[PDB]
Short mmCIF file of C-alpha atoms (C1' of nucleotides) and ligand atoms in Angstrom, two decimals:
data_model
loop_
_atom_site.label_atom_id
_atom_site.label_comp_id
_atom_site.label_asym_id
_atom_site.label_seq_id
_atom_site.Cartn_x
_atom_site.Cartn_y
_atom_site.Cartn_z
CA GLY A 20 -97.40 -73.79 36.02
CA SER A 21 -96.32 -77.42 35.84
CA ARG A 22 -99.14 -79.71 34.70
CA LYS A 23 -100.01 -83.24 35.88
CA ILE A 24 -100.70 -85.60 32.96
CA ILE A 25 -101.58 -89.27 33.37
CA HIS A 26 -101.49 -91.83 30.60
CA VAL A 27 -103.52 -94.97 31.42
CA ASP A 28 -102.92 -98.03 29.25
CA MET A 29 -104.62 -101.42 29.53
CA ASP A 30 -102.31 -104.45 29.74
CA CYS A 31 -102.41 -106.82 26.73
CA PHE A 32 -105.93 -105.47 26.29
CA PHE A 33 -107.61 -107.84 23.79
CA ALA A 34 -105.89 -110.89 25.30
CA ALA A 35 -106.61 -109.77 28.87
CA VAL A 36 -110.33 -109.57 28.05
CA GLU A 37 -110.32 -113.07 26.50
CA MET A 38 -108.64 -114.57 29.60
CA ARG A 39 -111.08 -112.95 32.01
CA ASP A 40 -113.93 -114.37 29.92
CA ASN A 41 -112.29 -117.80 29.42
CA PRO A 42 -109.99 -118.60 32.37
CA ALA A 43 -108.75 -121.68 30.49
CA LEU A 44 -106.62 -119.29 28.40
CA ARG A 45 -104.76 -117.72 31.33
CA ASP A 46 -101.57 -119.79 31.38
CA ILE A 47 -101.21 -120.91 27.75
CA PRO A 48 -99.89 -118.76 24.86
CA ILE A 49 -102.81 -117.00 23.18
CA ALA A 50 -103.14 -114.28 20.57
CA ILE A 51 -105.90 -112.37 18.80
CA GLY A 52 -105.08 -112.43 15.09
CA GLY A 53 -106.09 -113.79 11.70
CA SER A 54 -105.15 -117.34 10.89
CA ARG A 55 -102.18 -118.20 8.69
CA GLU A 56 -104.73 -119.37 6.12
CA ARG A 57 -106.33 -115.91 6.21
CA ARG A 58 -102.84 -114.34 5.80
CA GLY A 59 -103.38 -112.58 9.11
CA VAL A 60 -101.19 -110.83 11.64
CA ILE A 61 -101.17 -110.75 15.42
CA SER A 62 -103.21 -107.97 16.99
CA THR A 63 -101.85 -108.69 20.45
CA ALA A 64 -100.72 -111.60 22.59
CA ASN A 65 -100.60 -112.56 26.24
CA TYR A 66 -97.37 -112.84 28.21
CA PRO A 67 -97.04 -116.64 27.81
CA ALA A 68 -97.00 -116.05 24.05
CA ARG A 69 -94.80 -112.95 24.25
CA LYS A 70 -92.25 -115.15 26.04
CA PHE A 71 -91.72 -116.88 22.66
CA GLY A 72 -91.24 -113.55 20.89
CA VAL A 73 -94.84 -113.11 19.67
CA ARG A 74 -95.56 -109.40 19.11
CA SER A 75 -98.29 -107.14 17.70
CA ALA A 76 -98.15 -106.67 13.89
CA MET A 77 -96.14 -109.87 13.43
CA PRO A 78 -97.27 -112.09 10.53
CA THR A 79 -99.20 -114.98 12.01
CA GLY A 80 -97.06 -117.53 10.18
CA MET A 81 -94.04 -116.08 11.98
CA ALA A 82 -95.81 -116.07 15.36
CA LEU A 83 -96.54 -119.78 14.83
CA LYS A 84 -92.94 -120.54 13.90
CA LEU A 85 -91.83 -118.90 17.15
CA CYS A 86 -94.70 -120.42 19.17
CA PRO A 87 -96.14 -123.57 17.56
CA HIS A 88 -98.76 -124.07 20.30
CA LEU A 89 -100.09 -120.51 19.94
CA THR A 90 -103.87 -120.40 20.33
CA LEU A 91 -105.36 -118.02 17.78
CA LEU A 92 -108.51 -116.07 18.64
CA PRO A 93 -110.71 -114.12 16.22
CA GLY A 94 -111.62 -111.16 18.38
CA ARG A 95 -114.78 -110.05 20.20
CA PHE A 96 -114.82 -106.32 19.48
CA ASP A 97 -118.10 -105.52 21.25
CA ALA A 98 -116.53 -107.02 24.38
CA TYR A 99 -113.51 -104.73 23.99
CA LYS A 100 -115.71 -101.69 23.29
CA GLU A 101 -117.63 -102.52 26.46
CA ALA A 102 -114.44 -102.55 28.52
CA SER A 103 -113.32 -99.34 26.78
CA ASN A 104 -116.58 -97.56 27.62
CA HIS A 105 -116.20 -98.75 31.22
CA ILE A 106 -112.67 -97.47 31.80
CA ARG A 107 -113.57 -94.13 30.19
CA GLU A 108 -116.45 -93.76 32.64
CA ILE A 109 -114.01 -94.57 35.46
CA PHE A 110 -111.70 -91.82 34.17
CA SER A 111 -114.70 -89.47 34.26
CA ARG A 112 -115.08 -89.95 38.02
CA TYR A 113 -111.74 -88.14 38.40
CA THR A 114 -111.77 -85.47 35.67
CA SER A 115 -113.49 -84.44 32.47
CA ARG A 116 -110.08 -83.68 30.91
CA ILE A 117 -109.86 -87.02 29.08
CA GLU A 118 -108.38 -87.61 25.63
CA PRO A 119 -108.83 -91.22 24.53
CA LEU A 120 -106.16 -92.30 22.06
CA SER A 121 -107.57 -95.78 21.24
CA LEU A 122 -109.95 -98.22 22.93
CA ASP A 123 -107.61 -99.05 25.77
CA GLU A 124 -105.77 -95.84 26.62
CA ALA A 125 -106.23 -92.15 27.35
CA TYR A 126 -104.53 -89.02 28.54
CA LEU A 127 -105.91 -87.34 31.65
CA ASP A 128 -104.99 -83.82 32.76
CA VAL A 129 -105.34 -83.88 36.55
CA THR A 130 -103.57 -80.56 37.15
CA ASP A 131 -106.68 -78.93 38.61
CA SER A 132 -107.79 -82.11 40.40
CA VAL A 133 -108.01 -82.36 44.19
CA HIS A 134 -109.05 -86.02 44.36
CA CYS A 135 -106.10 -87.59 46.16
CA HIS A 136 -104.71 -84.47 47.84
CA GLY A 137 -103.83 -83.45 44.29
CA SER A 138 -101.46 -86.41 44.01
CA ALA A 139 -101.34 -87.57 40.39
CA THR A 140 -99.44 -90.66 41.58
CA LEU A 141 -102.25 -91.64 43.96
CA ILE A 142 -104.90 -90.79 41.36
CA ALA A 143 -103.23 -93.09 38.82
CA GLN A 144 -103.01 -95.80 41.48
CA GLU A 145 -106.66 -95.38 42.45
CA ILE A 146 -107.65 -95.57 38.77
CA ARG A 147 -105.64 -98.74 38.09
CA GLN A 148 -107.32 -100.21 41.13
CA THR A 149 -111.10 -100.16 40.72
CA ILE A 150 -110.39 -100.77 37.02
CA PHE A 151 -109.10 -104.08 38.33
CA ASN A 152 -112.11 -104.06 40.57
CA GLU A 153 -115.26 -103.65 38.44
CA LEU A 154 -113.55 -105.08 35.29
CA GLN A 155 -110.99 -107.71 36.49
CA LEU A 156 -108.43 -106.43 33.97
CA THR A 157 -105.17 -104.70 34.85
CA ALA A 158 -103.84 -101.38 33.63
CA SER A 159 -100.55 -99.56 33.79
CA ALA A 160 -100.00 -95.83 34.05
CA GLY A 161 -97.46 -93.10 33.54
CA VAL A 162 -97.38 -89.71 35.26
CA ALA A 163 -95.40 -86.80 33.80
CA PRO A 164 -95.60 -83.01 33.31
CA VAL A 165 -96.34 -83.36 29.54
CA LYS A 166 -98.14 -85.85 27.28
CA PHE A 167 -95.34 -87.74 25.57
CA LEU A 168 -93.35 -88.39 28.74
CA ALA A 169 -96.49 -89.73 30.43
CA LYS A 170 -97.09 -92.12 27.53
CA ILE A 171 -93.49 -93.31 27.61
CA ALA A 172 -93.78 -93.66 31.39
CA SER A 173 -96.83 -95.95 31.24
CA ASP A 174 -94.79 -98.51 29.31
CA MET A 175 -91.90 -98.65 31.73
CA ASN A 176 -93.56 -100.54 34.59
CA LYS A 177 -95.92 -102.73 32.49
CA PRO A 178 -97.88 -104.83 33.47
CA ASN A 179 -99.98 -103.74 36.44
CA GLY A 180 -97.62 -100.94 37.46
CA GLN A 181 -96.95 -97.25 37.03
CA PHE A 182 -94.03 -94.83 36.65
CA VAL A 183 -93.73 -91.17 37.70
CA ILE A 184 -91.42 -88.60 36.10
CA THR A 185 -91.01 -85.27 37.98
CA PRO A 186 -89.70 -82.04 36.45
CA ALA A 187 -86.42 -82.48 38.32
CA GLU A 188 -86.08 -85.98 36.84
CA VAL A 189 -86.77 -84.94 33.21
CA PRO A 190 -83.21 -84.03 32.08
CA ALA A 191 -81.53 -87.26 33.27
CA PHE A 192 -84.41 -89.23 31.77
CA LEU A 193 -84.11 -87.51 28.38
CA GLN A 194 -80.33 -87.79 28.16
CA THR A 195 -80.24 -91.43 26.99
CA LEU A 196 -83.90 -91.82 25.93
CA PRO A 197 -83.92 -93.45 22.46
CA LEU A 198 -85.68 -91.28 19.91
CA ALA A 199 -87.78 -94.25 18.77
CA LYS A 200 -89.48 -94.22 22.20
CA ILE A 201 -91.08 -90.85 21.29
CA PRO A 202 -94.63 -91.45 20.00
CA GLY A 203 -94.57 -90.43 16.34
CA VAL A 204 -90.93 -91.33 15.77
CA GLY A 205 -91.34 -94.62 13.92
CA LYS A 206 -89.08 -97.06 12.12
CA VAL A 207 -88.36 -94.90 9.08
CA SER A 208 -87.63 -91.76 11.13
CA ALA A 209 -85.44 -93.62 13.60
CA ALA A 210 -83.34 -95.04 10.76
CA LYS A 211 -82.91 -91.60 9.15
CA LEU A 212 -81.93 -90.15 12.54
CA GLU A 213 -79.66 -93.10 13.28
CA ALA A 214 -77.86 -92.72 9.98
CA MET A 215 -76.96 -89.12 10.81
CA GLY A 216 -75.72 -90.09 14.28
CA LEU A 217 -78.86 -89.23 16.28
CA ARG A 218 -80.02 -92.05 18.53
CA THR A 219 -81.16 -90.38 21.75
CA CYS A 220 -82.74 -87.18 22.94
CA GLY A 221 -79.32 -86.25 24.30
CA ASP A 222 -77.89 -86.48 20.77
CA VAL A 223 -80.64 -84.25 19.39
CA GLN A 224 -80.10 -81.71 22.19
CA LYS A 225 -76.71 -80.93 20.63
CA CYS A 226 -78.44 -80.10 17.32
CA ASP A 227 -79.38 -76.77 15.80
CA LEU A 228 -83.09 -76.14 15.31
CA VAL A 229 -82.41 -74.51 11.93
CA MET A 230 -80.75 -77.73 10.76
CA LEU A 231 -83.57 -79.92 12.07
CA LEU A 232 -86.06 -77.65 10.28
CA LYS A 233 -84.19 -77.83 6.97
CA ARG A 234 -83.84 -81.61 7.12
CA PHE A 235 -87.21 -82.68 8.58
CA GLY A 236 -89.61 -79.75 8.15
CA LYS A 237 -92.14 -79.30 10.93
CA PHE A 238 -91.22 -82.74 12.25
CA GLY A 239 -87.74 -81.40 13.00
CA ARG A 240 -89.29 -78.83 15.32
CA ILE A 241 -91.15 -81.67 17.09
CA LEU A 242 -87.84 -83.57 17.46
CA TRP A 243 -86.13 -80.46 18.80
CA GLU A 244 -88.94 -79.82 21.30
CA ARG A 245 -89.40 -83.41 22.46
CA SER A 246 -85.68 -83.91 22.99
CA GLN A 247 -85.86 -81.20 25.66
CA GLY A 248 -89.02 -82.42 27.39
CA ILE A 249 -91.06 -79.69 25.62
CA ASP A 250 -94.58 -80.84 24.75
CA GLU A 251 -97.23 -78.15 25.11
CA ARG A 252 -100.02 -80.18 23.49
CA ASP A 253 -103.12 -79.76 25.61
CA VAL A 254 -105.28 -82.70 26.61
CA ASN A 255 -108.16 -82.18 24.23
CA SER A 256 -111.42 -84.06 25.14
CA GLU A 257 -113.31 -82.77 22.04
CA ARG A 258 -111.79 -84.84 19.22
CA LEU A 259 -114.22 -86.24 16.66
CA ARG A 260 -114.08 -89.11 14.20
CA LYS A 261 -113.25 -88.06 10.64
CA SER A 262 -113.47 -91.22 8.51
CA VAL A 263 -114.80 -94.74 8.48
CA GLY A 264 -113.33 -97.55 6.43
CA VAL A 265 -114.03 -101.21 5.73
CA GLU A 266 -111.40 -103.35 4.05
CA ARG A 267 -110.66 -107.03 3.65
CA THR A 268 -107.53 -109.01 2.73
CA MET A 269 -108.38 -112.20 0.85
CA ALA A 270 -106.73 -115.55 1.52
CA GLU A 271 -105.80 -115.75 -2.19
CA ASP A 272 -105.01 -112.84 -4.47
CA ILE A 273 -107.84 -112.08 -6.91
CA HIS A 274 -107.17 -111.63 -10.61
CA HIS A 275 -110.55 -110.79 -12.20
CA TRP A 276 -112.90 -107.82 -11.94
CA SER A 277 -115.84 -110.12 -11.16
CA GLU A 278 -114.01 -111.24 -8.02
CA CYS A 279 -113.29 -107.65 -6.97
CA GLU A 280 -116.90 -106.61 -7.55
CA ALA A 281 -118.13 -109.58 -5.48
CA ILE A 282 -115.89 -108.51 -2.57
CA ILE A 283 -117.32 -104.97 -2.70
CA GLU A 284 -120.86 -106.37 -2.51
CA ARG A 285 -120.00 -107.94 0.86
CA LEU A 286 -118.07 -104.90 2.09
CA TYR A 287 -120.71 -102.31 1.28
CA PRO A 288 -123.47 -103.41 3.71
CA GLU A 289 -120.90 -103.36 6.52
CA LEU A 290 -119.74 -99.84 5.63
CA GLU A 291 -123.37 -98.70 5.51
CA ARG A 292 -124.21 -100.26 8.89
CA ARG A 293 -121.23 -98.58 10.56
CA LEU A 294 -121.79 -95.17 8.97
CA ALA A 295 -125.48 -95.31 9.94
CA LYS A 296 -124.56 -95.66 13.63
CA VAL A 297 -122.91 -92.22 13.52
CA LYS A 298 -124.70 -90.57 10.56
CA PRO A 299 -128.17 -92.08 10.14
CA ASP A 300 -128.84 -90.07 6.98
CA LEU A 301 -125.59 -91.38 5.41
CA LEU A 302 -124.50 -87.84 4.47
CA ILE A 303 -120.73 -87.61 4.05
CA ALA A 304 -118.03 -85.42 2.51
CA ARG A 305 -116.13 -87.93 0.33
CA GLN A 306 -116.19 -91.61 -0.54
CA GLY A 307 -113.67 -93.83 -2.23
CA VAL A 308 -111.93 -97.15 -2.58
CA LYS A 309 -108.62 -98.82 -1.87
CA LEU A 310 -106.77 -101.63 -3.63
CA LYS A 311 -103.59 -103.32 -2.44
CA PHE A 312 -101.66 -105.38 -4.95
CA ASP A 313 -99.62 -108.54 -4.57
CA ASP A 314 -96.51 -106.31 -4.63
CA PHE A 315 -98.00 -104.47 -1.62
CA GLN A 316 -98.18 -101.13 -3.42
CA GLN A 317 -101.50 -99.61 -2.47
CA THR A 318 -103.61 -96.97 -4.15
CA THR A 319 -106.66 -95.00 -3.06
CA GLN A 320 -109.03 -92.92 -5.11
CA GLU A 321 -111.60 -90.84 -3.35
CA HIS A 322 -113.74 -87.87 -4.27
CA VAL A 323 -116.27 -85.32 -3.07
CA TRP A 324 -119.61 -87.11 -2.85
CA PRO A 325 -122.65 -86.23 -0.79
CA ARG A 326 -124.05 -89.56 0.39
CA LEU A 327 -122.89 -93.18 0.71
CA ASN A 328 -123.57 -94.85 -2.63
CA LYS A 329 -122.70 -98.43 -3.61
CA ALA A 330 -122.81 -98.07 -7.40
CA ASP A 331 -120.39 -95.14 -7.39
CA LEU A 332 -117.97 -97.17 -5.25
CA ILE A 333 -118.18 -100.09 -7.69
CA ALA A 334 -117.69 -97.69 -10.62
CA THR A 335 -114.74 -96.04 -8.92
CA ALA A 336 -113.20 -99.42 -8.05
CA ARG A 337 -113.66 -100.43 -11.70
CA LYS A 338 -111.66 -97.40 -12.90
CA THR A 339 -108.95 -98.09 -10.30
CA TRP A 340 -108.92 -101.74 -11.35
CA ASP A 341 -108.58 -100.93 -15.05
CA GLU A 342 -106.21 -97.99 -14.67
CA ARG A 343 -103.70 -98.68 -11.86
CA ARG A 344 -103.59 -102.49 -11.62
CA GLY A 345 -101.19 -103.37 -14.45
CA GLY A 346 -101.77 -107.12 -14.36
CA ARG A 347 -100.89 -107.63 -10.69
CA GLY A 348 -102.85 -109.76 -8.26
CA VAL A 349 -104.96 -107.94 -5.66
CA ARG A 350 -104.78 -108.97 -2.01
CA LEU A 351 -107.05 -106.32 -0.45
CA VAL A 352 -110.16 -104.35 -1.38
CA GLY A 353 -111.34 -101.46 0.78
CA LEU A 354 -114.19 -98.96 0.91
CA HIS A 355 -113.83 -95.56 2.56
CA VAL A 356 -115.85 -92.52 3.62
CA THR A 357 -114.69 -89.08 4.76
CA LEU A 358 -117.09 -87.57 7.29
CA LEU A 359 -118.53 -84.05 7.07
CA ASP A 360 -116.63 -81.39 9.01
CA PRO A 361 -118.78 -80.59 12.02
"C1'" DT B 18 -92.33 -116.22 8.10
"C1'" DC B 19 -94.32 -112.95 4.90
"C1'" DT B 20 -96.73 -109.32 5.92
"C1'" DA B 21 -104.66 -106.79 9.45
"C1'" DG B 22 -107.96 -103.49 10.13
"C1'" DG B 23 -109.32 -99.70 12.72
"C1'" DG B 24 -107.82 -94.97 12.33
"C1'" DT B 25 -105.02 -89.64 12.51
"C1'" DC B 26 -101.87 -86.36 10.64
"C1'" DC B 27 -98.56 -84.31 7.32
"C1'" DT B 28 -96.91 -83.23 2.60
"C1'" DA B 29 -97.34 -81.73 -1.90
"C1'" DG B 30 -98.82 -80.11 -6.96
"C1'" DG B 31 -102.22 -78.01 -9.66
"C1'" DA B 32 -106.76 -75.66 -9.56
"C1'" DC B 33 -109.01 -71.85 -8.35
"C1'" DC B 34 -109.51 -67.51 -6.32
"C1'" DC B 35 -107.92 -62.45 -5.66
"C1'" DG C 28 -97.20 -64.17 -5.63
"C1'" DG C 29 -100.50 -65.72 -1.72
"C1'" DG C 30 -104.72 -68.96 0.73
"C1'" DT C 31 -107.32 -72.54 0.24
"C1'" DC C 32 -109.54 -76.83 -1.79
"C1'" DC C 33 -108.93 -81.34 -4.06
"C1'" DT C 34 -106.48 -85.44 -4.29
"C1'" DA C 35 -102.80 -89.35 -3.48
"C1'" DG C 36 -99.45 -91.19 -0.90
"C1'" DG C 37 -97.07 -92.43 3.17
"C1'" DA C 38 -95.51 -92.47 8.14
"C1'" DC C 39 -97.41 -93.62 12.31
"C1'" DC C 40 -100.69 -94.88 16.07
"C1'" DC C 41 -103.59 -98.81 18.54
"C1'" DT C 42 -104.85 -103.82 19.47
MG1 MG D 11 -102.33 -101.48 25.95
MG1 MG D 12 -103.04 -98.84 24.59
#
DNA sequence: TCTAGGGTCCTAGGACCC
DNA sequence: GGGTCCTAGGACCCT
């Protein structure tokens, strides 16, 4: 009953699309990200820029210190959504068992496939090709018996490559696998685990489940499972969107309510336009606001509300402003909607 | 160098329900 | 005391 799971992951997705559409960008360092003047960060970069140390989520001022000739791009999201829709349709030629995890990646369960003699390796290869055909972008892939190993595997032969982990290969692979490689083990978790002497899945294998449960709750059960290759999560294919948000970081912190209210006036029409694409009648479960202060503490206040409404968002932002600001500057204002359950 | 914007999921206290 | 809803915060994911 061993399953075949593929994780397909586009290479330097946003940047790859910009280079296809502007070949002048191919061999110089480029990045999609907000300018230093907009206090932006890097969304992604191409390999010429990564050579200098440019990475996703890095402050753009830092990316420019590392790479002074970096070419900053604003982003063409409809072009990325178009490429996303296209690779998802390519996935559909092979199976309906597709769980997209973001624009540029997905899990596929090809256990019950008989497309390439049932070879998940050859299916992944055929998918990466033809994606390169048809779209002129490259993808990488991982093949494993469970989700998280497949997702780790797709990173190991990036770019334009793939990696296959068989059941017989799982124990040696786990033994020295850093815990931070596990999707969902982030910086904070890895430091907590490091400070108790737990760096790798092999370290966690020597641990008692009861101890992991005491110290990490349900997450400790995830750690215990993942450190043994155990990951029973099914490829879904029926996941639905649950929220939509629109937020903006200003170039300068704002200090007056009038400024905050003016930001909301520009944010609201965008939130409405995006909700209306998915819920034309604007009916929702909750709506609310977000403020982030100059000390980077952030607060949200949100409440049951039946239908997108600008004045209530302004009013709610006003309360948040007056009540939780305590004289600090505000760097970000955000609007938010929680979608109805079905 | 100085910190985005799009999201999902988990936790947790009091309210409310029984 | 036990479910479940409401709400806020935070870790983490993607580019
Ligand atoms: Mg990618
Ligand atoms: Mg990806």
